[PDB]
Ligand binder design. Structure first.
Ligand SMILES: *[C@@H]1O[C@H](CO)[C@@H](O)[C@H](O)[C@H]1NC(C)=O
Lengths: 110, 377, 127
């Protein structure tokens, strides 16, 4: 059983904005800013896309945005580019000092 | 006969009252009565009930933690209701840096499985539990093992009669104000309040489980000096710390569970039922041979081993302490009325010689034994 | 720069034991905690536990508490994870991912950017 509620798959037209949700509890997403997003293209290892909800690493495109309301965090990719068709996973550090992941979302560029 | 060798020997003149302590020996003498030797061997307490079990060495395992951001209440663990763990709540600096939306003190809770490595058990002793083992061996030169509890005995000694022993079990300790603190191997007798006031984790004597330790906080100190981290720390083995605390305390030589003591007594006996063996016997008309040569004891007395060579077999030994001219007696016998039970069996004779030079006689004129002894002072 | 390289592919029969290495390069290994995450075939990521490379301290997931054992080699910049009594469920790609430890060497709270760098992976096949 997945600890974080993530949608199965998402599809969007090239150049348009789309949002991926991540539902948690008061003991992980609801209580702490420790929220991260990972991009995983088939075969490759996961790549840290967003951390501390909003923040993003150095070699990461500024199209990717982060949001958080109550126990729900959102990944927003404004302007869909070609090499976006990948698997996205949200993660959180719990109150108990452990790490939880989401189901995952398959993004389709169409 | 056993007291010959022991330096702690007391001589009692009968008709009486004797004082039996550990290591000490008592030799009783009465006219026309056999000489007796009394010794306290074991002052053990039978079945001791445990009062309290103290933990002297401990260890921390299975560390778990939960934390909250500021203004989100105190955290909770499932280990908090488990009394096998030492649990402690605290406060730590929180903010943007450690995933908190607000800056302030965030509540943290830590739980750790306290386990006991080495322990000790102070037991309960009632005066009624004490089993005194008094041995009575008549001075013959060839012995019943009598047990006495505070709740008189007729010590029947084979071929002599009976001893009418009645003892006062007051050594001097009040076993209500006292605790028998056993520790791994060694044991001590300490005061009640002192024992109950010890700052160590404990379990009731009744406890078998050996897990839910009270006062675990004595051995475990929780330190949070910079509001960053809450740390656990055991205080290490209190074994040596305890030994120093129990210096003046009365030690107990316990041997595998059962606890043996260093006793004391104020016994009273009656020589009325005692009779001297071999009174209807002849004299030994043959010759003797010194098995073991004359030796002065730690006390003024002298011992001697001899073997009868004649055909007299059960007969009385002609023993006399006299001068060079055989004129008169001077000393007295400790092994009263010596007897050769079997000629091929040797016989030990304790006697008190007079001060200065004297002569010890063993047997009659043909093959007679003439031995000079000079007694100091 | 930073390169996390775990051992090659390994095939193991059920009930056996797997040991997977993870060599850290291009950074100070001793001042980082190595995390272990398993990727099931076409499924969600599972956090297994961590090892503070400094002191050697570990924290394991309840799911793997008495099956997984994480170790470290300070002298060879390698992090090892041993999984005992393996089942058909354990058929997954195993990933190692770093995270910085506090300046004092302690690891109460992680750093905002937790899995900034990962390893290539290791497919453990259960036959
Ligand atoms: C406690 O910790 C030990 C490791 O020291 C581990 O093997 C065991 O599974 C843990 N027990 C529980 C109940 O978590």
């Amino acid at each position: 059983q997945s600890a974080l509620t993530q949608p199965a798959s998402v599809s969007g037209s090239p150049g348009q904005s789309i949002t991926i949700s991540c539902t948690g509890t008061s003991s992980d997403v609801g209580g702490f800013n420790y929220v991260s997003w990972f991009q995983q293209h088939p075969g490759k290892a996961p790549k840290l896309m967003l951390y501390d909800v909003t923040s993003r690493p150095s070699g990461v495109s500024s199209r990717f945005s982060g949001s958080k309301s109550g126990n729900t965090a959102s990944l927003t990719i404004s302007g869909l580019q070609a090499e976006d068709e990948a698997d996205y996973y949200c993660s959180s550090h719990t109150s108990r000092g452990t790490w939880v992941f989401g189901g995952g979302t398959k993004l389709t560029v169409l | 006969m056993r007291c010959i060798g022991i330096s702690n020997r007391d001589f009692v003149e009968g008709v009486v009252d004797i004082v039996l302590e550990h290591g000490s020996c008592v030799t009783t003498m009465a006219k026309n009565k056999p000489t007796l030797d009394f010794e306290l061997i074991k002052t053990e307490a039978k079945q001791p009930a445990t009062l309290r079990k103290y933990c002297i060495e401990a260890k921390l395992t299975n560390t778990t933690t939960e934390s909250r951001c500021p203004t989100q209440g105190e955290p909770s663990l499932n280990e908090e209701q488990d009394k096998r763990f030492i649990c402690k709540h605290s406060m730590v600096d929180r903010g943007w840096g450690n995933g908190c939306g607000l800056f302030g003190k965030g509540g943290i809770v830590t739980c750790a499985k306290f386990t006991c490595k080495k322990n000790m058990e102070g037991k309960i002793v009632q005066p009624e539990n004490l089993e005194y083992t008094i041995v009575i061996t008549p001075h013959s030169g060839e012995g019943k093992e009598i047990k006495i509890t505070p709740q008189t005995t007729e010590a029947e000694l084979t071929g002599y009669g009976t001893v009418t022993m009645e003892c006062s079990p007051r050594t001097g300790l009040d076993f209500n104000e006292m605790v028998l603190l056993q520790m791994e191997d060694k044991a001590w007798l300490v005061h009640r309040q002192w024992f109950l006031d010890l700052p160590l984790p404990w379990l009731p004597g009744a406890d078998t489980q050996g897990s839910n330790w009270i006062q675990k906080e004595t051995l475990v100190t929780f330190k949070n000096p910079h509001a960053k981290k809450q740390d656990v720390v055991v205080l290490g083995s209190q074994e040596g710390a305890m030994h120093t605390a129990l210096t003046g305390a009365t030690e107990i030589q316990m041997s595998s569970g059962n606890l043996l003591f260093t006793g004391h007594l104020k016994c009273r006996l009656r020589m009325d039922k005692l009779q001297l063996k071999g009174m209807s016997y002849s004299m030994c008309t043959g010759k003797f041979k010194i098995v073991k040569e004359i030796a002065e004891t730690q006390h003024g007395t002298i011992v001697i081993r001899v073997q009868y060579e004649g055909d007299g077999s059960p007969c009385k030994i002609p023993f006399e302490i006299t001068d060079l001219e055989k004129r008169h007696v001077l000393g007295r016998l400790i092994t009263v009325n010596p007897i050769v039970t079997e000629k091929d069996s040797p016989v030990n004779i304790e006697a008190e010689p007079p001060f200065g030079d004297s002569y010890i006689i063993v047997g009659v004129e043909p093959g007679q034994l003439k031995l000079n002894w000079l007694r100091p002072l | 720069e930073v390169q996390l390289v775990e051992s090659g592919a390994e095939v193991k029969k059920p009930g056996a034991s797997v040991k997977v290495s993870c060599k850290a390069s291009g950074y100070t290994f001793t001042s980082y905690a190595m995390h272990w995450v398993r990727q099931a075939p076409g499924q969600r990521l599972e956090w297994m536990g961590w090892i503070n490379a400094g002191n050697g301290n570990t924290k394991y997931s309840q799911k793997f508490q008495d099956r997984v054992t994480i170790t470290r080699d300070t002298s060879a910049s390698t992090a090892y994870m041993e999984l005992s009594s393996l089942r058909s469920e354990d058929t997954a790609i195993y990933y190692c991912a770093r995270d910085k430890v506090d300046d004092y060497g302690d690891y109460w709270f992680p750093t905002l950017w937790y899995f900034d760098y990962w390893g290539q992976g290791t497919l453990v096949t259960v036959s």
